[PDB]
Symmetry: none
Subunit: 368 residues, 4 copies
Amino acid sequence: PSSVQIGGLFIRNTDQEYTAFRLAIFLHNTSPNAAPFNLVPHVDNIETANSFAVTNAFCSQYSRGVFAIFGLYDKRSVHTLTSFCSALHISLITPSFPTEESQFVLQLRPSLRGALLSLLDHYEWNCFVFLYDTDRGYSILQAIMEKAGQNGWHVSAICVENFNDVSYRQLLEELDRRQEKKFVIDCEIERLQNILEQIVSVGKHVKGYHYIIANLGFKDISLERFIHGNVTGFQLVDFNTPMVTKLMDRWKKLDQREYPGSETPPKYTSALTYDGVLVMAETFRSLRRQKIDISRGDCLAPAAPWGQGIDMERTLKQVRIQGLTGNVQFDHYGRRVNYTMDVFELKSTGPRKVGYWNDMDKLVLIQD
Amino acid sequence: PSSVQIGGLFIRNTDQEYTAFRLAIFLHNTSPNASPFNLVPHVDNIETANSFAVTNAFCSQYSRGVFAIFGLYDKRSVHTLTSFCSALHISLITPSFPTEGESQFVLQLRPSLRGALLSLLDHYEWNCFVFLYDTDRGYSILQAIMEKAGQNGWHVSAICVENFNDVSYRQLLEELDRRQEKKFVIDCEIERLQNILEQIVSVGKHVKGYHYIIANLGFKDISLERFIHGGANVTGFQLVDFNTPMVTKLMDRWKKLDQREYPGSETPPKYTSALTYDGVLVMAETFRSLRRQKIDISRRNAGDCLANPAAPWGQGIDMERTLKQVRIQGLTGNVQFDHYGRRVNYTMDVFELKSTGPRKVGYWNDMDKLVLIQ
Amino acid sequence: PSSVQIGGLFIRNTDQEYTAFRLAIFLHNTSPNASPFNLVPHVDNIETANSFAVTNAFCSQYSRGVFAIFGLYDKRSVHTLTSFCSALHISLITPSFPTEGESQFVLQLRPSLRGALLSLLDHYEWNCFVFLYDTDRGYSILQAIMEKAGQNGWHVSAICVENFNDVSYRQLLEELDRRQEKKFVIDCEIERLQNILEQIVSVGKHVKGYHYIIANLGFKDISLERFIHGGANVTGFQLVDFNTPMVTKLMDRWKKLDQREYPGSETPPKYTSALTYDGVLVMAETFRSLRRQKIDISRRNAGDCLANPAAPWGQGIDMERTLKQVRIQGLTGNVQFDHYGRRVNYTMDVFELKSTGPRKVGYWNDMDKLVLIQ
Amino acid sequence: PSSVQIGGLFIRNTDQEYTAFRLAIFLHNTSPNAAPFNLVPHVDNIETANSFAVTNAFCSQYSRGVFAIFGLYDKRSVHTLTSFCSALHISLITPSFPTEESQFVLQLRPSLRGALLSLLDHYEWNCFVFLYDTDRGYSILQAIMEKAGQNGWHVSAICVENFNDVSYRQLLEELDRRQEKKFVIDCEIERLQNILEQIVSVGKHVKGYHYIIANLGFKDISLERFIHGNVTGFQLVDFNTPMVTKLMDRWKKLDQREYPGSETPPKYTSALTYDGVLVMAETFRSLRRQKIDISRGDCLAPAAPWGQGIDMERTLKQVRIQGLTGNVQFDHYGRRVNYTMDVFELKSTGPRKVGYWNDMDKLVLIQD
């Protein structure tokens, strides 16, 4: 097997992720090293991102026999993509939000719930607001509410879906009336820019107000205005490693005509997509090493089980490499294990690393 | 067109709903000729209730040439079913929880409950209470409760009761009793609701001084004899009125039914049974309206539910418009939808438990909010 | 004499006892030849359980040439049955309540409970408590409790629960709660005991701070899951030991029984079932003893139970003496009677209810009174 | 019908009752007035008074077809006599203790429970002792205990069955140690004499100690020692009526050879037996007036019902005469209704009537 077909499912507002996925495949195509299989993606980008489009693209990919699909989903499509992959015995590698038991799924994105809870405990926060959206699911929100109930917190959860400039202004005025000082922001990247620009315009960009940015791309979003005017966040990928250095000095190639979004440093989702490509490449090497000839139907047949799918799924779930997100390893549930992320607090000189959070030592802070 | 094909979807633990569907369609079929058509149902009762099984069944229904589909869904299968129905212009009638956040080609028989519950909480002047909930029916109630609490500064302790056993409920109740919190709001599945009520009786939290609010439309569908004797304050919402000619006739027919042929007939129909009965009535009236509007219906189509590109039904827009343009009287009252698909101009009774039993204290309507009897 | 005729009397709601009687006699009949006789029972199961029906059945048994009679009686039929048995020298074996106040030709399988209950009350240092009782099993316990209270100056409030419905129990519990009395002693029929326990759970009196004492020998024969979860202190007396080879073998045979042929086998045997099983064992051993003593038995007689003048059986005195001179091991322990007919040298376990469940706290015996585990 | 056979069942220590029953029959034999039926009793006195003797005598009487039996029973024989009479459809007239629903039974003795409770309420007794026996049943005892529980009384119930002189002495010493001042005595007549003589010997016969004698024969027991040394009691029959005057001036005939016990004024049980004879005579007149020819088996047949027994039983239950115990009338349950009894309190001059108790006005006391 030298031309291995794989499937790719992307949704709207994922230009950078698609570019990173293409770049990872291209590097895998030009990496001789030690079977020389070349990954050809049958990528099917969908704009609507509704359940019907997900089903249509998934069945079309299944008709081509891709043995695996690298997909991205939202709250409205997770229950469709995961269900089809679990029933049709095709492994599903997704860098999107993890799903709170599951099969045939590899969630590359680490669960942000644990890190956020540890940070809140360390900062001894008792009353705060929870400006949030539902795009990534009700995983952080439920944990915050449950933790507040078990700890007697005065939390004010505020949904900011379908908000316009008037809505943000009204919300800001209400917060000023309540004199809320501590904020937790959990929204999509574009919504983060909208919230941050509205806050800096209305006049709450000072260091007295504490803002926790609940995402893994803290350095991926520009916060230059806040230095002039206490902001904490989580960073997933370390920029001081040899492998990310190789990615950067290969990323400087500004072929924006063929690689849109390459003008800026890759976002955390882009790093996760690159890491997923490495996981698929490494596990294909493992299957080839085990001398398992992977080969082969249509959707809505009754289930069309894949005999080789179970062993292939297990091989994915037992991979352990050193990727952009560190020790990439999965447990038997498909989640991420043995991972760490740095905690950056903004200072006068810029972002500064205070500590890092991992699943075995919780949060550990640098002290003298 | 004497025969009309109607799709039907049923999930697990919905036996009573299926019998109500069969009973409603039988009454319409065996009815005096109010001058004219028959409904043939293609029904699929899947137990797993996963998205893949729902998609397979919906494709089978689409291949079977159904004009409308009566489906049940949970948080798992809500998105796939609604999106598939809207994409192919095949309308759906559901008694499940609403999917607020815009929609098309879907008619929610179940009315919104957030307004009534919020009105009740404002009337009771509650500040701190334990909100026990699950995520089987979405998160609309949970989001609304917390948004109201944040705007009003309520210290609401929300606890999810998913995947808890009897020991877990006992430990949770003991911890809450140690925290000295008296007010509770329960919004769970009917099976989980029975389990929590049994655990409350076992612990001994059904005495005077404890207030429980049951957030569903089946307050009279459950047993509270232990709570009646204990004397704890219980408030609930009942949608089905038992003092109307229509419910009386249906109950008379309900008691005279074969238990083996109609499982669940040994007990009074629940609010979901009334809701699904109303849904069949809505479909019948809309087909009459299509006949009156001189709009002929035909499938014209095959079963390529995944035809590329999509081939939406040409008469779906008119069918959806007619479905939303029907005002009828049923077990739940004035069944009348707006242009969105939700229920509007609906009324529900509010029952407070006393020693004599469940006595209505007032009603709630979309216009006057909560009006209590004084 | 291969065949031995034995009389049997059963009152209403004693199905389990009858099956235990049949099971015990079947095991003796189908047993290895421990070197020799069979027991044929003449059984009468009257439902009214009045004195006239008992007299008719006893005359039929006497006309049927039975040497011993296994009878059940209540306060209504205790005097007629005991007097008839003593007058004609036809001995009786009973598991019912004792008839203290002298007796002859009667063997009480059920041991006296007043000693154990009085010892428990003295240990608990109780002063004021509510004694709920009925009069189905005589008045010996009631008289003893009040005599002890008078000699010790206890303010015992005794209430009879005869001919009360569920509303009556609820009203009585509410009145007692208003009077602020926490300690209760329940001595009722097993059916009435279940009803009172259910009412206690419904009212909500099964929480910490309430102490209940159940005065019977079937503490493990009833369900207290609600009381286990509530945490109220419950003390009871268990006569049957479940950690002996004999009870283990009998339980193994009990589970492998036909439910239709042996009603009540779906549940573990109650203390009365163990008592009646022991009674059949006592009769078997005594017949062996008569065979060993070279005392031939024969009815010699007709059925003129009302023969004037009375014609008592000539071998009745020796039979009664041999019955009282037998020490055996059975489900209730060392079954051994004195010259009066009551049980002596008997032990019963004392169980206190905790979160883990019913855990034995000590035992009670006729010699050392109450000995608790420390 | 001129020679009507009836049955008579008497127990040990009932010589006076048997004499009164014989005297009443004799007067009925010599009372022409206005069918001239003469009552012939097949009396079967039993000494053992156990259940076997009761059954034997009852069956022998049934063999003679007596249509009714005038019986006396104790705690050990009530459940046998009543059961046979209810099942065999023969009316049972008994002057013994009433039974707390029943059929074919006429209890001539009024229920003493109501009068005792009313007297205790009037005297405002809170703590007392209850020297009692079980011969007449647990009817008064249960009521006293239940009333005490509902009123919070400090009652000390003391059984005095099988007590010898040492037992009474020990009981008296214990009472002195407890310093109990108020006594309620409910025992058989012979036990009353034993208790009273022991009390007067030990030295508690003074007026300071209050003794309530729970019986209907207060004047039938000599209390002369207490006048020299507060004793209340109930009297059922009034000695100041024309009919009791006739009974007295006929009772002075001292034919003790044929009428034992006639040397003393009749006891309350004797008056009840005399009244029962009148009830049977009056109801036979009613049956004869209704032109119902009463006629007719063996016991232990299966039930041998008597068709005329039901109407005869109802006629007994609807009789209303003026006898020694006043307005003799029975309800549909066989108990006594529309009856009254005087309450006598001992004074220096002797017994004095304070008031009277009836079932409609409870207790009413004479005051100026």
